[PDB]
Design a binder for this molecule. Structure first.
Ligand SMILES: [Mg+2]
Ligand SMILES: [Mg+2]
Ligand SMILES: [Mg+2]
Ligand SMILES: [Mg+2]
Ligand SMILES: [Mg+2]
Ligand SMILES: [Mg+2]
Ligand SMILES: [Mg+2]
Ligand SMILES: [Mg+2]
Ligand SMILES: [Mg+2]
Ligand SMILES: [Mg+2]
Ligand SMILES: [Mg+2]
Ligand SMILES: [Mg+2]
Ligand SMILES: [Mg+2]
Ligand SMILES: [Mg+2]
Ligand SMILES: [Mg+2]
Ligand SMILES: [Mg+2]
Ligand SMILES: [Mg+2]
Ligand SMILES: [Mg+2]
Ligand SMILES: [Mg+2]
Ligand SMILES: [Mg+2]
Ligand SMILES: [Mg+2]
Ligand SMILES: [Mg+2]
Ligand SMILES: [Mg+2]
Ligand SMILES: [Mg+2]
Ligand SMILES: [Mg+2]
Ligand SMILES: [Mg+2]
Ligand SMILES: [Mg+2]
Ligand SMILES: [Mg+2]
Ligand SMILES: [Mg+2]
Ligand SMILES: [Mg+2]
Ligand SMILES: [Mg+2]
Ligand SMILES: [Mg+2]
Ligand SMILES: [Mg+2]
Ligand SMILES: [Mg+2]
Ligand SMILES: [Mg+2]
Ligand SMILES: [Mg+2]
Ligand SMILES: [Mg+2]
Ligand SMILES: [Mg+2]
Ligand SMILES: [Mg+2]
Ligand SMILES: [Mg+2]
Ligand SMILES: [Mg+2]
Ligand SMILES: [Mg+2]
Ligand SMILES: [Mg+2]
Ligand SMILES: [Mg+2]
Ligand SMILES: [Mg+2]
Ligand SMILES: [Mg+2]
Ligand SMILES: [Mg+2]
Ligand SMILES: [Mg+2]
Ligand SMILES: [Mg+2]
Ligand SMILES: [Mg+2]
Ligand SMILES: [Mg+2]
Ligand SMILES: [Mg+2]
Ligand SMILES: [Mg+2]
Ligand SMILES: [Mg+2]
Ligand SMILES: [Mg+2]
Ligand SMILES: [Mg+2]
Ligand SMILES: [Mg+2]
Ligand SMILES: [Mg+2]
Ligand SMILES: [Mg+2]
Ligand SMILES: [Mg+2]
Ligand SMILES: [Mg+2]
Ligand SMILES: [Mg+2]
Ligand SMILES: [Mg+2]
Ligand SMILES: [Mg+2]
Ligand SMILES: [Mg+2]
Ligand SMILES: [Mg+2]
Ligand SMILES: [Mg+2]
Ligand SMILES: [Mg+2]
Ligand SMILES: [Mg+2]
Ligand SMILES: [Mg+2]
Ligand SMILES: [Mg+2]
Ligand SMILES: [Mg+2]
Ligand SMILES: [Mg+2]
Ligand SMILES: [Mg+2]
Ligand SMILES: [Mg+2]
Ligand SMILES: [Mg+2]
Ligand SMILES: [Mg+2]
Ligand SMILES: [Mg+2]
Ligand SMILES: [Mg+2]
Ligand SMILES: [Mg+2]
Ligand SMILES: [Mg+2]
Ligand SMILES: [Mg+2]
Ligand SMILES: [Mg+2]
Ligand SMILES: [Mg+2]
Ligand SMILES: [Mg+2]
Ligand SMILES: [Mg+2]
Ligand SMILES: [Mg+2]
Ligand SMILES: [Mg+2]
Ligand SMILES: [Mg+2]
Lengths: 208, 141, 57, 38, 174
RNA sequence: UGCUGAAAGCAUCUAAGCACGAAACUUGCCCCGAGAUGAGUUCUCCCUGACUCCUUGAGAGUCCUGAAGGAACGUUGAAGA
RNA sequence: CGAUGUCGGCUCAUCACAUCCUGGGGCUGAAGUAGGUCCCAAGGGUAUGGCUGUUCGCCAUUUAAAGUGGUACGCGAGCUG
RNA sequence: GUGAAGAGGGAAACAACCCAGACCGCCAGCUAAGGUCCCAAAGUCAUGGUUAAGUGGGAAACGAUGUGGGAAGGCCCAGAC
């Protein structure tokens, strides 16, 4: 199905033979089920979960009630997962990191680090024009953006400067190294999106 | 001496049902567009939507002559750099069977605010059930 | 506009515009589109009699 | 096969067939004589 | 025209039924069903079957003469049951049956386990020969054609899966 | 490329019918996505006092209440012109 | 002609298919390897250098390939000159 | 001949092509070219055929048991193709 978890930086695990494997430490606290959606009401089968612990004055009544229907404590934020026919869950149930004890590889979704207004060189890997040899005010500029009379227009999806990052991106099939049940961790190989403290949706690899 | 024009507020609009099972697409679509526009009515005014609400059910079973089941293509552009999509009459019914009647009628309606207003009148359905039992929509042929 | 109205009101009584007008011309009826269209909207019970009058021819 | 615009019966065993709108020439003896179109 | 004007004989123990245009022929080997074309019209006349072209339709004789020749094969199928004799030519080429799955080894890196749709009885007298039996000419001919298509005759040594009656043209090296 | 099979006693991949068949096509993978005006769905939350005027409207008010929530302001950020 | 900046390079591209590679097929004077030609196929990919203002071309060394074209012989209110 | 110096209707849009020459007004009727299932005024008109290719709705040499008409010419009861 999937679990929500805060990113907690990066480390490495040294395997006894020698290999140091760079790991992302994802803390995965008790993901508790706030709602179960089904074909009768909603037209599709899913579960809504929560995690963390939001202070009571910061949570609003419309959500405070929403948690009181389940009976769970008010976690910081809500996420939904689609069920794969066979599995079935109940409201108020706490899903733990022990689901990933069986799996080998995981898709990790997160929000990428925001680079702000990025130019074409940074954003699209556009090539810098000649740094000298006569060049006039046009070193890192994008160059041409179209043809002439014929279109007489720039085409849609033309790679230009603009907002880079702060976008939801998914890194697929990362190898799970260790699944610590006691501290509630999930060590995956490689790097996943977003900064330390960002929320990650970790789930089993679709590309088996 | 100022000839009659239909005043929207006074327009008494009627509800109808059409079973499109085994009907010819275009010959259905025409008779639909004639009604939706309100041509059949004797108080027809071209600038007012005098036509009737129609419920076309069993849209997926609509018939087409010759080899148009495979050969008829529904092109459209995505508004993108080179994004011309196409779909044959089979492929269209496989995915979106409502679109077939929709597109055929929309081509035969006028083009503009009122033409779009008189398309809203049309209610297409893939299945045989319709949830507009509340209007007592009478049977049409 | 009138012709459309007449063609509409005629087909309610089971005759097309083309045949109706020939029917009226062959019965030497001199009434114009402007009025046939006025009658079509207002007095249908009257209008019907013109369609019968046309049906004779 | 050949896709020429003027297919014809080259040998005796060659045979003309219309498959899916296209005129073809199928042969038992020489597969060289196999040819379509036209 | 000429095929259509030649009644099909129906031997005893062959239950024929005409559900409008949908024909059902049952016998000893197997029950067979055929949804026939609308342009054809078919009837029982005495012992034999009769196939007539419908009035109004353009191509009647062509459609009827087909129905005739189908039901002719359909009656022979349920009575006798058709067979096809395939043989595997070339060294290291093996054919072995286990249930309803033919295990072909045709010089590949993986043994090819061909499935048998419908009532098709597959046998092997020798290890390099497949004799398969059944009711439908259609399914038999297809299965045979698949079993062939895994390794067609190489026109040099004649290597591959072949029909028994099939002649193969080989040529010399140049 | 085939199977059965006429028209055309045969023959033939097809005219009924029936299978395979490619980085193309439609999905599958990732992202945006109800301004999708056809503006969808589920869950939760909150407001359950009166008088006046009328050319009786989905009408203009007088008074008492101001909720859920939001914005504003501040401290700010791996968010950001 | 009361001005539509003309070659080549850079940047940025985009479409066509008459396909250079990669994918699927027929014939072959197709043993295999490797081809030859033809058919379908436009998803993606498709050198770096020496000389010359060059486009092209020749040459050296690579590459699975180093495609042919359209786009004001694409692109100077984007650069060069 | 038309435009130039001529509006109006038709040919999708289209000075010169087809129809036709605007003195002014009318919420009258008959016709031209061209049309009559819907966009859009009028035939889902009548009868008898053709077309299966979406031909109609771009094109040649040449290719072909496509398919309709005809007018002829090779054989039968000694029973040919
Ligand atoms: Mg930032
Ligand atoms: Mg920068
Ligand atoms: Mg980078
Ligand atoms: Mg550079
Ligand atoms: Mg540079
Ligand atoms: Mg300078
Ligand atoms: Mg400058
Ligand atoms: Mg300068
Ligand atoms: Mg500078
Ligand atoms: Mg500048
Ligand atoms: Mg400047
Ligand atoms: Mg992997
Ligand atoms: Mg084909
Ligand atoms: Mg074609
Ligand atoms: Mg045969
Ligand atoms: Mg055969
Ligand atoms: Mg398939
Ligand atoms: Mg690949
Ligand atoms: Mg979203
Ligand atoms: Mg609504
Ligand atoms: Mg809602
Ligand atoms: Mg709801
Ligand atoms: Mg109250
Ligand atoms: Mg009020
Ligand atoms: Mg007050
Ligand atoms: Mg207030
Ligand atoms: Mg207050
Ligand atoms: Mg508040
Ligand atoms: Mg908010
Ligand atoms: Mg502010
Ligand atoms: Mg602030
Ligand atoms: Mg600050
Ligand atoms: Mg700041
Ligand atoms: Mg000038
Ligand atoms: Mg000027
Ligand atoms: Mg210049
Ligand atoms: Mg030059
Ligand atoms: Mg260069
Ligand atoms: Mg580039
Ligand atoms: Mg090609
Ligand atoms: Mg060529
Ligand atoms: Mg080619
Ligand atoms: Mg090639
Ligand atoms: Mg490869
Ligand atoms: Mg391969
Ligand atoms: Mg091949
Ligand atoms: Mg082609
Ligand atoms: Mg390409
Ligand atoms: Mg394309
Ligand atoms: Mg492309
Ligand atoms: Mg694809
Ligand atoms: Mg790419
Ligand atoms: Mg040097
Ligand atoms: Mg150089
Ligand atoms: Mg070289
Ligand atoms: Mg190489
Ligand atoms: Mg080129
Ligand atoms: Mg050009
Ligand atoms: Mg040029
Ligand atoms: Mg060019
Ligand atoms: Mg240029
Ligand atoms: Mg260029
Ligand atoms: Mg420019
Ligand atoms: Mg230039
Ligand atoms: Mg400049
Ligand atoms: Mg100079
Ligand atoms: Mg200089
Ligand atoms: Mg002059
Ligand atoms: Mg004129
Ligand atoms: Mg004109
Ligand atoms: Mg024209
Ligand atoms: Mg027109
Ligand atoms: Mg027009
Ligand atoms: Mg016009
Ligand atoms: Mg011209
Ligand atoms: Mg004329
Ligand atoms: Mg005159
Ligand atoms: Mg005059
Ligand atoms: Mg006058
Ligand atoms: Mg007239
Ligand atoms: Mg007259
Ligand atoms: Mg006409
Ligand atoms: Mg218009
Ligand atoms: Mg018009
Ligand atoms: Mg009309
Ligand atoms: Mg008719
Ligand atoms: Mg055409
Ligand atoms: Mg010819
Ligand atoms: Mg004769």
């Amino acid at each position: 199905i999937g679990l929500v978890g805060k990113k907690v930086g990066m480390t490495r695990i040294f395997t006894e033979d020698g290999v140091s494997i760079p790991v992302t430490v994802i803390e995965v606290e008790a993901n508790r089920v706030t709602q179960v959606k089904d074909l009768a009401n909603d037209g599709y089968r899913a579960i809504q979960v929560t995690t963390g612990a939001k202070k009571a004055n910061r949570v609003t009544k419309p959500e405070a009630g929403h948690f009181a229907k389940a009976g769970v404590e008010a976690g910081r934020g809500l996420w939904e997962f689609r069920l794969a026919e066979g599995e079935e869950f109940t409201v108020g149930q706490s899903i733990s990191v022990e689901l990933f004890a069986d799996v080998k590889k995981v898709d990790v979704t997160g929000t990428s680090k925001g680079k702000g207004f990025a130019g074409t060189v940074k954003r699209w890997n556009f090539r810098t024009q000649d740094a000298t040899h006569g060049n006039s005010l046009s070193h890192r500029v994008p160059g041409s953006i179209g043809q002439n009379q014929t279109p007489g227009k720039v085409f849609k999806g033309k790679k230009m400067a603009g907002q880079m990052g702060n976008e939801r991106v998914t890194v697929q099939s990362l190898d799970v190294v260790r699944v610590d049940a006691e501290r509630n961790l999930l060590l995956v190989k490689g790097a996943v999106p977003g900064a330390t403290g960002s929320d990650l949706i970790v789930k089993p690899a679709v590309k088996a | 001496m100022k000839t009659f024009t239909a005043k929207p507020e006074t327009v008494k609009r009627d509800w109808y049902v059409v079973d499109a099972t085994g009907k010819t697409l275009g010959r259905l679509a025409t008779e639909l567009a004639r009604r939706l526009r309100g041509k059949h009515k004797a108080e027809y005014t071209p600038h007012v939507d005098t036509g009737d609400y129609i419920i076309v059910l069993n849209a997926d079973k609509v018939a087409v002559t010759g080899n148009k089941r495979t050969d008829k293509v529904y092109y459209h552009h995505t508004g993108h750099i080179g994004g011309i999509k196409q779909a044959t009459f089979e492929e269209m019914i496989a995915r979106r069977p409502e679109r077939v009647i929709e597109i055929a009628v929309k081509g035969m309606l006028p083009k503009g605010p009122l033409g779009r207003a008189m398309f809203r009148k049309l209610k297409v359905y893939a299945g045989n059930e319709h949830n507009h039992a509340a209007q007592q929509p009478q049977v049409l042929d | 506009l009138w012709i459309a109205r007449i063609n509409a009101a005629a087909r309610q009584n089971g005759i097309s515009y083309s045949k109706f007008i020939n029917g009226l011309k062959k019965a030497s009826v001199e009434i114009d589109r402007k009025i046939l269209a006025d009658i079509a909207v207002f007095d249908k019970v009257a209008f019907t009699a013109l369609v019968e009058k046309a049906k004779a021819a | 096969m050949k896709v020429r615009a003027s297919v014809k019966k080259l040998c005796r065993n060659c045979k003309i067939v219309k498959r899916d709108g296209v005129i073809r020439v199928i042969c038992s003896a020489e597969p060289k004589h196999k040819q379509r179109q036209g | 025209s000429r095929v259509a004007k030649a009644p099909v004989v129906v031997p005893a123990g062959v239950d024929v039924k005409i559900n409008g245009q949908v024909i059902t022929i049952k016998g000893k080997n197997g029950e067979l069903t055929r949804t026939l074309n609308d342009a054809v019209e078919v009837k029982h006349a005495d012992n034999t079957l009769t196939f007539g072209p419908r009035d109004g339709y353009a191509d009647g004789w062509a459609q009827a003469g087909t129905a005739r020749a189908l039901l002719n094969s359909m009656v022979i199928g349920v009575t006798e049951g058709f067979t096809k004799k395939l043989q595997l030519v070339g060294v290291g080429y093996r054919a072995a049956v286990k249930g309803n799955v033919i295990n072909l080894s045709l010089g590949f890196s993986h043994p090819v386990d061909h499935q048998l749709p419908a009532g098709i009885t597959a046998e092997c007298p020798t290890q390099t020969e497949i004799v398969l039996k059944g009711a439908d000419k259609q399914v038999i001919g297809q299965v045979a054609a698949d079993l062939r298509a895994y390794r067609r005759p190489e026109p040099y040594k004649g290597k591959g899966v072949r029909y028994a009656d099939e002649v193969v043209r080989t040529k010399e090296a140049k």
